[PDB]
Write a protein that binds this ligand. Structure first.
Ligand SMILES: [Ca+2]
Ligand code: NA
Lengths: 63, 281
């Protein structure tokens, strides 16, 4: 599993819990949606982009 | 002893170096997380920070901007790695914080700083899935002003027939760069779409890291500075060539790979780009 489209619209807390069940060594970083980010590819990382309510606003994916 | 990372050889930068051209007097802004100016294999000429809580552009709290800068311009000496354009005047334009993210206004402010400070080349190893009018206006202004603007295509892989190139790469004024490995195969993460322009090495790329270290990173972030460095080599051999001409020289001399949706025009070849007469190999 490398993408979690089912987490869009869920809380950041539930997204973290779910991603860590599937990928327990994931390095999760929470970022505001609508920011610009570095474009290196990190197989261990999952960025979670959240709206101002702290809900997931974009499909989480490994990288 | 110095090592030449395979990607520097793969784009044919040593052919420019042997002609005597290494990017001297070309100003390249690395618009990124900063650049560690204490690294002995880098020479940072100047810069500025647009990150409100990190006012020093010469401290890189992430590592990414230092890695990207070493692909552009790691020094030609007896240590570390060799950059594509090892004599370039390298500018640290910090618009991303420690966590690798920045607000659109910070990126725009760095592009405006680069224009005001007469940068010849901008590298943006960065992106997001949405554009904005103000972002498009800043890149378009830099290009209208004569700057060669290079960006990572993104690491969003494929999504059927849909483009997955992010912004600012997706804007026509910006050269969007995808990632291949040492065998010229597209990296599985490399974004795709009709906006993909050219490819460059983006897998297991050795470069400079903060605190006098080196390491291998992956990403379209790593491919973009090969193209920004190639633009600096070309301008050092042809100092009057416009950004229009530098961009076309790179596009018109790639080694064609697969379908353009996946590979754009193919792998850049700076040797062929810096000749007067251009064709694909
Ligand atoms: Ca060196
Ligand atoms: Na573009």
């Amino acid at each position: 599993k490398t993408e979690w489209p089912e987490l869009v619209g869920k809380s950041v807390e539930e997204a973290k819990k779910v991603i860590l069940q599937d990928k327990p060594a994931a390095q999760i970083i929470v970022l505001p949606v609508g920011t610009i980010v570095t474009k290196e590819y990190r197989i261990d990382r999952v960025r979670l982009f959240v709206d101002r309510l702290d809900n997931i606003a974009q499909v989480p994916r490994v990288g | 002893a110095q090592s030449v990372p395979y990607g520097v050889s793969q784009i044919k930068a040593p052919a420019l170096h042997s002609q005597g051209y290494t990017g001297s007097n070309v100003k390249v802004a690395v618009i990124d997380s900063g650049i560690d100016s204490s690294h002995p294999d880098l020479k940072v000429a100047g810069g500025a920070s647009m990150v409100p809580s990190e006012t020093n552009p010469f401290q890189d709290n992430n590592s990414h901007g230092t890695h990207v800068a070493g692909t552009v311009a790691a020094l030609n000496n007896s240590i570390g790695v060799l950059g594509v354009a090892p004599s370039a005047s390298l500018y640290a334009v910090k618009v991303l914080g420690a966590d690798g993210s920045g607000q659109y206004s910070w990126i725009i402010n760095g592009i405006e700083w680069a224009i005001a400070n007469n940068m010849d080349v901008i590298n943006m190893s960065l992106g997001g899935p949405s554009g904005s009018a103000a972002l498009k206006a800043a890149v378009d202004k830099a290009v209208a002003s004569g700057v060669v603007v290079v960006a990572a295509a993104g690491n969003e892989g494929t999504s059927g027939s849909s483009s997955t190139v992010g912004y600012p790469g997706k804007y026509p004024s910006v050269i969007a760069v995808g990632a291949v490995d040492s065998s010229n195969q597209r990296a599985s993460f490399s974004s795709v779409g009709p906006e993909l322009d050219v490819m460059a090495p983006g897998v297991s790329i050795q470069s400079t890291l903060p605190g006098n270290k080196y390491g291998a990173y992956n990403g379209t972030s790593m491919a973009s500075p090969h193209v920004a460095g190639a633009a600096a080599l070309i301008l050092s051999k042809h100092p009057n060539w416009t950004n229009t001409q530098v961009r076309s020289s790179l596009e018109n001399t790639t080694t064609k790979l697969g379908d353009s949706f996946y590979y754009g025009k193919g792998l850049i070849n700076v040797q062929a780009a810096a000749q007067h007469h251009h064709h694909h190999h």
